[PDB]
Enzyme design. Structure first.
Site, PDB file in Angstrom:
ATOM      1  CG  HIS B  41      -0.654   0.371   2.470  1.00 32.96           C
ATOM      2  ND1 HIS B  41      -0.707  -0.531   3.509  1.00 32.96           N
ATOM      3  CD2 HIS B  41      -0.234   1.542   3.007  1.00 32.96           C
ATOM      4  CE1 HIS B  41      -0.294   0.053   4.618  1.00 32.96           C
ATOM      5  NE2 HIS B  41       0.010   1.309   4.339  1.00 32.96           N
ATOM      6  CG  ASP B  90      -0.642  -3.763   2.619  1.00 38.42           C
ATOM      7  OD1 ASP B  90       0.067  -3.406   1.643  1.00 38.42           O
ATOM      8  OD2 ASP B  90      -0.942  -2.997   3.557  1.00 38.42           O
ATOM      9  CG  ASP B 179      -2.476  -0.451  16.786  1.00 38.93           C
ATOM     10  OD1 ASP B 179      -1.932  -1.514  16.392  1.00 38.93           O
ATOM     11  OD2 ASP B 179      -3.429   0.075  16.164  1.00 38.93           O
ATOM     12  N   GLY B 183       2.730   5.413   9.528  1.00 36.87           N
ATOM     13  CA  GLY B 183       4.170   5.633   9.341  1.00 36.87           C
ATOM     14  C   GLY B 183       4.976   4.367   9.574  1.00 36.87           C
ATOM     15  CB  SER B 185       2.412   0.911   6.678  1.00 39.04           C
ATOM     16  OG  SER B 185       1.130   0.869   7.267  1.00 39.04           O
ATOM     17  N   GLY B 186       4.677  -1.399   6.685  1.00 39.39           N
ATOM     18  CA  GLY B 186       5.710  -2.111   5.918  1.00 39.39           C
ATOM     19  C   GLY B 186       6.807  -2.640   6.821  1.00 39.39           C
TER      20      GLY B 186
HETATM   21  C1  LIG Z   1      -3.630   5.974   6.678  1.00 37.77           C
HETATM   22  C2  LIG Z   1      -2.333   5.456   6.084  1.00 37.77           C
HETATM   23  N1  LIG Z   1      -1.791   5.904   4.994  1.00 37.77           N
HETATM   24  N2  LIG Z   1      -0.635   5.186   4.768  1.00 37.77           N
HETATM   25  C3  LIG Z   1       0.169   5.317   3.654  1.00 37.77           C
HETATM   26  C4  LIG Z   1       1.533   5.243   3.812  1.00 37.77           C
HETATM   27  C5  LIG Z   1       2.341   5.368   2.687  1.00 37.77           C
HETATM   28  C6  LIG Z   1       1.782   5.553   1.431  1.00 37.77           C
HETATM   29  C7  LIG Z   1       0.405   5.620   1.283  1.00 37.77           C
HETATM   30  C8  LIG Z   1      -0.179   5.842  -0.100  1.00 37.77           C
HETATM   31  N3  LIG Z   1      -1.106   4.784  -0.520  1.00 37.77           N
HETATM   32  C9  LIG Z   1      -2.403   5.090  -0.744  1.00 37.77           C
HETATM   33  O1  LIG Z   1      -2.816   6.228  -0.598  1.00 37.77           O
HETATM   34  N4  LIG Z   1      -3.244   4.110  -1.131  1.00 37.77           N
HETATM   35  C10 LIG Z   1      -4.585   4.417  -1.364  1.00 37.77           C
HETATM   36  C11 LIG Z   1      -5.140   4.079  -2.583  1.00 37.77           C
HETATM   37  C12 LIG Z   1      -6.467   4.381  -2.838  1.00 37.77           C
HETATM   38  C13 LIG Z   1      -7.242   5.021  -1.881  1.00 37.77           C
HETATM   39  C14 LIG Z   1      -6.685   5.362  -0.654  1.00 37.77           C
HETATM   40  C15 LIG Z   1      -5.357   5.057  -0.396  1.00 37.77           C
HETATM   41  C16 LIG Z   1      -0.407   5.499   2.401  1.00 37.77           C
HETATM   42  C17 LIG Z   1      -0.442   4.295   5.765  1.00 37.77           C
HETATM   43  O2  LIG Z   1       0.580   3.413   5.893  1.00 37.77           O
HETATM   44  C18 LIG Z   1      -1.508   4.431   6.597  1.00 37.77           C
HETATM   45  C19 LIG Z   1      -1.708   3.643   7.807  1.00 37.77           C
HETATM   46  C20 LIG Z   1      -2.759   3.730   8.648  1.00 37.77           C
HETATM   47  C21 LIG Z   1      -2.521   2.741   9.702  1.00 37.77           C
HETATM   48  C22 LIG Z   1      -3.198   2.340  10.855  1.00 37.77           C
HETATM   49  N5  LIG Z   1      -2.705   1.378  11.632  1.00 37.77           N
HETATM   50  C23 LIG Z   1      -1.557   0.779  11.368  1.00 37.77           C
HETATM   51  C24 LIG Z   1      -0.825   1.129  10.257  1.00 37.77           C
HETATM   52  C25 LIG Z   1      -1.297   2.124   9.402  1.00 37.77           C
HETATM   53  N6  LIG Z   1      -0.832   2.686   8.240  1.00 37.77           N
END
Ligand SMILES: Cc1nn(-c2cccc(CNC(=O)Nc3ccccc3)c2)c(O)c1-c1cc2cnccc2[nH]1
Ligand SMILES: [Ca+2]
Ligand SMILES: [Cl-]
Ligand SMILES: [Cl-]
Lengths: 57, 247
Positions: B41, B90, B179, B183, B185-186
């Site tokens: 993602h 993911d 939790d 930031g 993620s991955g």
């Molecule tokens: C919110 C969020 N945004 N990103 C993010 C980080 C880096 C690049 C992209 C771009 N990708 C994109 O926009 N796709 C997308 C595609 C279509 C529609 C919406 C989004 C997003 C995250 O990692 C989170 C994240 C939330 C979360 C909650 N709990 C544990 C972990 C968590 N991680």
């Protein structure tokens, strides 16, 4: 059997035909003569934390 | 990471920082000298694929201490089954343009055998999740690498205690205290067994972090072992982004 207690293996485990079992080790490791244990063969094997390993050396 | 502590420098040596145009993008996990596992993602919105940087041996983002190692990302490999902006499948495999040099501060996490991962690792209650993510819901991100011990839930038990698939798992707390978060993620979900650490999970995503009545969502790496292994044995293809079939 590999499903139980991990076949006694420290790492990886394969079942064989019969009451046969084979333990294995990840790259950067070797199997000891006990046939279960793994020992590093390299300086920086995976999944080990050097500063902690050294702290106990 | 919410509700965690600082990972002492060098105690999280497999942790990767992903940058885009110098900006924090995501986390990652080193599994070999040229291979990093991340989350698909993270790349949904990538415009210029050529500006992706991976940093190893990182700790304190405010300083340079010389243990840091930066590489360009030569390839981003994503499963065919992954739909952008979703949670399922993911996962991402990143090829570094040049190998990192293994040091006290740069070490890969063991990618386990599936069987081992399934029959044994999946039953280790507690595992470690890390990153430079948000310290708080709607909060600032961390300057120092953070880590958090989280318990894993059976999927049944997850649902009771609460879209969870067989390609995911739940880990954490529902009390809203603890939790992984934006930031992060991955990043790795790392599981100890008999003196060694293994890659069991990837920090995926969801609604919020530290959201009461909810559990953290993680990509079930065991589902991907064979897929990863095959890719790692394969020759690079031109162009950064690669969609590879799954299974
Ligand atoms: C919110 C969020 N945004 N990103 C993010 C980080 C880096 C690049 C992209 C771009 N990708 C994109 O926009 N796709 C997308 C595609 C279509 C529609 C919406 C989004 C997003 C995250 O990692 C989170 C994240 C939330 C979360 C909650 N709990 C544990 C972990 C968590 N991680
Ligand atoms: Ca630094
Ligand atoms: Cl090939
Ligand atoms: Cl390109």
């Amino acid at each position: 059997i590999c499903v139980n207690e991990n076949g006694g293996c420290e790492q990886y485990c394969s079942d064989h035909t019969g009451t046969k079992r084979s333990c294995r080790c990840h790259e950067g490791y070797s199997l000891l003569a006990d046939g279960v244990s793994c020992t590093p063969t390299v300086e920086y094997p995976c999944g080990k934390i050097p500063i902690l390993e050294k702290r106990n050396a | 990471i919410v509700g965690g502590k600082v990972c002492p420098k060098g105690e999280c040596p497999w942790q990767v920082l992903l940058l885009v145009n110098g900006a924090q993008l995501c986390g990652g996990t080193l599994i070999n000298t040229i291979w990093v596992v991340s989350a698909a993602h993270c790349f949904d919105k990538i415009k210029n694929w050529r500006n992706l940087i991976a940093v190893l041996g990182e700790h304190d983002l405010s300083e340079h201490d010389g243990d840091e190692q930066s590489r360009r990302v030569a390839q981003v490999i994503i499963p065919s089954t992954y739909v952008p902006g979703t949670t399922n499948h993911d996962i991402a495999l990143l090829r570094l343009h040049q190998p990192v040099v293994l040091t006290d501060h740069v070490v890969p996490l063991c990618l386990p055998e599936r069987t081992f991962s399934e029959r044994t690792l999946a039953f280790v209650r507690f595992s470690l999740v890390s990153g430079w993510g948000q310290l708080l819901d709607r909060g600032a991100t961390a300057l120092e690498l953070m880590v958090l011990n989280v318990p894993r839930l059976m999927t049944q038990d997850c649902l009771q205690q609460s879209n969870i698939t067989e390609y995911m798992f739940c880990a954490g707390y529902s009390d809203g205290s603890k939790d992984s978060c934006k930031g992060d993620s991955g990043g790795p979900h790392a599981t100890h067994y008999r003196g060694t650490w293994y890659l069991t999970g990837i920090v995926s995503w969801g609604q919020g972090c530290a959201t009461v009545g909810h559990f953290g969502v993680y990509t079930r790496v065991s589902q991907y072992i064979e897929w990863l292994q095959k890719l790692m044995r394969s020759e690079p293809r031109p162009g950064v982004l690669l969609r590879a079939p799954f299974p």
